[PDB]
């Protein structure tokens, strides 16, 4: 199984490399060659979830058989027996093993600095270039630093 | 199964490449060569959902057999027994494995900037060029940036 773990590491590294390639394909025309640096971290879960759900519909029952005895005298006896049929959904789901659980991307732009408007524009391009998903916990940093 | 995961990555990359090709086929005449850059992120779910639904119709029962005893004297006894037949739908669905769960497209247009009207027109063309589906969670960014 350790060979499987090794190949999982290979998958994660391949994903990171592909994302880096896309980042380059976007930023190389916009910024130029050597005016930026970017690295990508991709964390992938490899669990084996397998779920079975059996759901009913309480608010729409359908009476199948029914008995109702109601006699008076004073005495009032109200017996009743009822059998129901209910909407039944049975869903069996099997999640894919390797899923990107969190994605971190950081891009540093060489100074000569960059204005806030262009930094936010680059961030907007990257959002969509990488597939930024904040609800997944992903993080995207864009900074303007001084290259040596 | 890790080979299957590798081929799933290949499928996702192929989808992204096809969408990029369509984006180019639309924008190359409109904008020109080298006046734009665009990248596409496609996230695909590969679950194995398999659902079985059994639904009834509570509001239209059909009486199959019926017994009704109603005697008086004062004393009033009202016995009743009833059997019903109901509309029964049984649907077994099996979803396709790989489905595009979210799609992100970002396009950056070289300045010399672009007016808001033409930006929105390009966005309208892309909506339909790519098959934008906001209800799916898809995202489409169109920006006017300064190429270096």
């Amino acid at each position: 199984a350790s060979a499987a773990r090794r190949k999982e590491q290979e998958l994660e590294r391949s994903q990171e490399q592909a994302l880096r390639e896309k980042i380059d394909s976007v930023l190389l025309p916009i910024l130029g060659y050597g005016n930026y640096t970017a690295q990508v971290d991709i964390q992938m879960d490899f669990s084996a979830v397998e779920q079975t759900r059996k759901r009913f519909d309480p608010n729409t029952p359908a009476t199948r058989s029914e008995y109702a005895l109601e006699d008076y005298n004073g005495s009032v006896r109200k017996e009743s027996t009822r059998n129901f049929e209910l909407d039944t959904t049975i869903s069996h789901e099997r999640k894919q093993t390797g899923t990107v659980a969190r994605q971190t991307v950081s891009v540093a732009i060489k100074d000569r600095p960059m204005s806030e408007s262009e930094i936010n524009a680059i961030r907007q391009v990257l959002i969509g270039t990488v597939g930024f998903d904040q609800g997944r916990g992903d993080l995207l940093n864009v900074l303007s630093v001084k290259f040596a | 199964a890790s080979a299957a995961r590798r081929k799933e990555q290949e499928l996702e990359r192929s989808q992204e490449q096809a969408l990029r090709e369509k984006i180019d086929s639309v924008l190359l005449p409109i904008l020109g060569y080298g006046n734009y850059t665009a990248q596409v992120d496609i996230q695909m779910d590969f679950s194995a959902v398999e659902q079985t639904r059994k639904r009834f119709d509570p509001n239209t029962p059909a009486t199959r057999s019926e017994y009704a005893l109603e005697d008086y004297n004062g004393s009033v006894r009202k016995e009743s027994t009833r059997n019903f037949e109901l509309d029964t739908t049984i649907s077994h669905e099996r979803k396709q494995t790989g489905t595009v769960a979210r799609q992100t497209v970002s396009v950056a247009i070289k300045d010399r900037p672009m007016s808001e009207s033409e930006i929105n027109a390009i966005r309208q063309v892309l909506i339909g060029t790519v098959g934008f589906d906001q209800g799916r969670g898809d995202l489409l960014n169109v920006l006017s940036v300064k190429f270096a």
Binding site: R64, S65, Y67, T81, R82, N83, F84, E85 | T81, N83
Partner: peptide, 12 residues
């Protein structure tokens, strides 16, 4: 009565 119900108990 119809014990048809997979959980029919009323029976009677």
């Amino acid at each position: 009565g119809l014990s048809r119900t997979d959980g029919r108990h009323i029976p009677a």
